[PDB]
C-alpha cells in the first residue's frame, strides 16, 4: 500500500519542496532524464542540514580569523587554510584554546551528528517506498573507515593530532604524514587488499557500463524487466563475455559483484589503518621479517638524480 | 512471449562465420573457430603466443639470473640508464626487454580480439574503447615516457612487491606528487567511480524480488537527492568516468620527467598574480 | 631460520589464499547460475 504520488507531492515537514519540478535540456540529451525536484525534507533531513552548516560556519569563521578578516587574502589563501586538531602536548583533553584546537573539536562533533542523521534519512526513505535497505548498509560500511580516521585511531593512539585537519590541502598532508610516520604504507598488506578492491571496482564499473551501452539497441539497460525474462541484449552480453573470458554472469548477480567489491574496500581500509599504529609501528621492518621485501644490493641511482 | 530456454539454443542461434577484421581485410579469417568456450581468431593466436612467451621470459629472468624461488623477492629490472635506448643480448636487462615486448603484443592482441567479437554479435564498440584507455596507460608508462626521457632504464621493474619501490622513488623524486593537478583529477575520478558502483549495485538489488513497479526507484532517488538519472544514463556515466580516470592520469606521469621537475614550485605563480599580490603585512605577505 | 614470522602467515598468506579461493568459488557459482534454464525471450521471434 504505497501511493507514489502522495509520497512525492505532500506538504508539511514530512513532505517535499522544489515543486513544481524543473527541466534541464542538456541533461535530457546527454543523460536521458531532465526533471529536477521535488526533494523530501523530514526530521532526519533537517537535523543533518543544520548540523552540517553549524560545522561549516565554525570552519569558515576560523579561516577568516586566521587571514585577519581580509577578503582579498581570504580569496588568495583559501585552498591552503586549515583548522587543525590540538597538538600532541595535550592528550585527548578538551581544555584547549579556540585557536589551537577547540574549533576543530566542535566542528568534528557536529559533522559526526550530521552523517549519522543522514544514514537515518536513507534508511527511513528506503522503507517509505517499497525498496530494500541496501544503500543504508553500504553507507555504514563507508562510515566505518570515516569513524576510524576521525574517532577511533586517535582514541587508541592517545591524541587528537593523529586526525586530519579541515582543509583542501590538509587531507593530502594527512595522507603523506601518516604514511611517513608508520614505516612505509606500501608494505601494509591490508593497504594492498584495499587497493586490490578499489582498482577492481573501477574495472568492473567500466566493464558493466560499456557492455550495457553497447547492447542498448535491444533495451538491455531496463534491468528491472530483464530480471523477469531476458531478451536479445542480455543474451548478447552473456555470449560476449563467455566468448572472451570463458564465463559470464546474469542481469541479477552482476550487481551483487558490484555491491561486494565496493563494500570490501572500506572495510579492509579500516582494518589496515587501525592496525597501522597500534600493533605494527613500522611496516617495512615487518615486511623484512615476513620475507616480502626484495634485496636490491646495487641500485642504479642515476635515474633518481637530476 | 517468454518460456524456458536451456541456453544451448541461445548459443547455437548466434554463432555465425566471418564478420571480423581479418575477414574484411584478407577476405577470410584463418582461425575462425571456437576452442571450448573461447573464440580463436587472428589476434587470438598472436595474443596467446605473446602470453606464453611473456610468462616464460619472466620466469626465466626470475628463477635463473637471480637464483631465487621466492616470488615476492624478484626484481625483473630494465637496463641501466647509461645504456640509452640500445638493446644488447650480452647485457643484464635484455630479458626484461623481451618480456615487456611480449606483454605489449598480448595486450594489443586482446584489444583487437574484442573488436572481432563485437562485430560478430552486432554490438557497439564501447568495451574496446574502455579497455584501450588502460592499454594506453601501459603504453605511456613503458614506451612513450622512456623514449622521451632517452633510456629504457626509465621503465618500471616487473616484480610483485618491487614495482612499488619504483612508484615510491618516482613519487618522492618529484615531490610533492599530491600537488600534481592531473593526479588529483585521477584520484577524484577513482573515488567517484567506486561510489557510483556501490550506488548502482544497491539500487538494483533493492528492487529485485518485489511486487512493485519500475517507478519506485525513481521516486526513491528523487526523494533523497532531488534528481534521478535514468537507466541509460547510469551506465553511460559509469563508462565515461571509468575511462577518464586513467586518461587523465596518463598526463600526470608523462609530464613528470619532461617539462616539470618539482610540483611544489609549479604553484609559485599563484600568489604573484596582480589581483592580490602586495596586499598583506607580516607572515601574510605574497 | 629461513621462515617468516607467525604474523607473516596470519596477515599476508592466509588472506591471499582466501581471496584466490573465494574468487574461484564465487566465479563457479555465478557461472552455474547464469547458464541454467529459465524464462527467456525466443531468439528466433525476438530478432
Amino acid at each position: 500500500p504505497i501511493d507514489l504520488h502522495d509520497e512525492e507531492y505532500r506538504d508539511g515537514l514530512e513532505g517535499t519542496i522544489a515543486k513544481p519540478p524543473g527541466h534541464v535540456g542538456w541533461m535530457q540529451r546527454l543523460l536521458g532524464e531532465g526533471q529536477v525536484g521535488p526533494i523530501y525534507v523530514g526530521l532526519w533531513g533537517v537535523i543533518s542540514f543544520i548540523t552540517f552548516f553549524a560545522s561549516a560556519f565554525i570552519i569558515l569563521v576560523d579561516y577568516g580569523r586566521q587571514v585577519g578578516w581580509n577578503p582579498i587574502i581570504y580569496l588568495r589563501e583559501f585552498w591552503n587554510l586549515a583548522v587543525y586538531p590540538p597538538p600532541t602536548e595535550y592528550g585527548l583533553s578538551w581544555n584547549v584554546p579556540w585557536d589551537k584546537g577547540g574549533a576543530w573539536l566542535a566542528a568534528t562533533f557536529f559533522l559526526h551528528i550530521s552523517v549519522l542523521t543522514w544514514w537515518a534519512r536513507l534508511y527511513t526513505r528506503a522503507k517509505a517506498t517499497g525498496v530494500g535497505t541496501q544503500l543504508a548498509w553500504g553507507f555504514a560500511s563507508a562510515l566505518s573507515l570515516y569513524f576510524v580516521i576521525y574517532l577511533f585511531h586517535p582514541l587508541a593512539l592517545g591524541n587528537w593530532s593523529a586526525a586530519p585537519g579541515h582543509g583542501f590541502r590538509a587531507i593530502l598532508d594527512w595522507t603523506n604524514y601518516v604514511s611517513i610516520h608508520w614505516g612505509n604504507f606500501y608494505y601494509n598488506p591490508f593497504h594492498m587488499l584495499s587497493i586490490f578492491f578499489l582498482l577492481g571496482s573501477t574495472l568492473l564499473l567500466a566493464m558493466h557500463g560499456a557492455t550495457i551501452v553497447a547492447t542498448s539497441k535491444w533495451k538491455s539497460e531496463m534491468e528491472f524487466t530483464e530480471m523477469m525474462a531476458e531478451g536479445p541484449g542480455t543474451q548478447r552480453a552473456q555470449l560476449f563475455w563467455r566468448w572472451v573470458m570463458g564465463w559470464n554472469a546474469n542481469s541479477y548477480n552482476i550487481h551483487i559483484w558490484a555491491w561486494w567489491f565496493a563494500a570490501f574496500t572500506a572495510i579492509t581500509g579500516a582494518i589496515g589503518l587501525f592496525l597501522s599504529g597500534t600493533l605494527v609501528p613500522d611496516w617495512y621492518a615487518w615486511g623484512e621479517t615476513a620475507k616480502i621485501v626484495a634485496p636490491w644490493p646495487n641500485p642504479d641511482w642515476a635515474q633518481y638524480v637530476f | 512471449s517468454a518460456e524456458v530456454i536451456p541456453f544451448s539454443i541461445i548459443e547455437e542461434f548466434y554463432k555465425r562465420p566471418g564478420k571480423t577484421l581479418a575477414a574484411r581485410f584478407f577476405g577470410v579469417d584463418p582461425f575462425d573457430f571456437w576452442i571450448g568456450r573461447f573464440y580463436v581468431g587472428l589476434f587470438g593466436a598472436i595474443s596467446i603466443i605473446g602470453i606464453i612467451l611473456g610468462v616464460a621470459f619472466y620466469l626465466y629472468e626470475g628463477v635463473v639470473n637471480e637464483g631465487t624461488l621466492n616470488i615476492l623477492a624478484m626484481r625483473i629490472e630494465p637496463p641501466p640508464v647509461s645504456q640509452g635506448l640500445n638493446v644488447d643480448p650480452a647485457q643484464p636487462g635484455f630479458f626484461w626487454f623481451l618480456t615487456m615486448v611480449a606483454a605489449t603484443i598480448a595486450f594489443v592482441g586482446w584489444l583487437l580480439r574484442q573488436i572481432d567479437i563485437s562485430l560478430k554479435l552486432d554490438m557497439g564498440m564501447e568495451v574496446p574503447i574502455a579497455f584501450g584507455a588502460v592499454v594506453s596507460s601501459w603504453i605511456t608508462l613503458q614506451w612513450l615516457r622512456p623514449i622521451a626521457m632517452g633510456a629504457w632504464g626509465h621503465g618500471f621493474p616487473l616484480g610483485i612487491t618491487h614495482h612499488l619501490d619504483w612508484v615510491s622513488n618516482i613519487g618522492y623524486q618529484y615531490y610533492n606528487f599530491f600537488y600534481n593537478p592531473f593526479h588529483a583529477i585521477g584520484i577524484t575520478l577513482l573515488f567517484a567511480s567506486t561510489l557510483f558502483l556501490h550506488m548502482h549495485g544497491s539500487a538494483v538489488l533493492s528492487e529485485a524480488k518485489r511486487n512493485i513497479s519500475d517507478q519506485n526507484i525513481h521516486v526513491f532517488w528523487r526523494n533523497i537527492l532531488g534528481y534521478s538519472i535514468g537507466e541509460i544514463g547510469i551506465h553511460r556515466v559509469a563508462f565515461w568516468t571509468g575511462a577518464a580516470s586513467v586518461l587523465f592520469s596518463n598526463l600526470c606521469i608523462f609530464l613528470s620527467g619532461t617539462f616539470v621537475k618539482d610540483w611544489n614550485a609549479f604553484w609559485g605563480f599563484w600568489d604573484k598574480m596582480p589581483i592580490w599580490n602586495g596586499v598583506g603585512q607580516g607572515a601574510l605577505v605574497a | 631460520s629461513p621462515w617468516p614470522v607467525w604474523s607473516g602467515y596470519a596477515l599476508c598468506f592466509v588472506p591471499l589464499a582466501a581471496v584466490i579461493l573465494g574468487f574461484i568459488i564465487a566465479a563457479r557459482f555465478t557461472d552455474k547460475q547464469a547458464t541454467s534454464a529459465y524464462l527467456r525471450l525466443d531468439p528466433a521471434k525476438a530478432n
Partner: peptide
Amino acid sequence: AAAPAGAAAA
C-alpha cells in the same frame, strides 16, 4: 516458473 533472479514464481 523458473526466473533469472533464482526465484520460481507461479
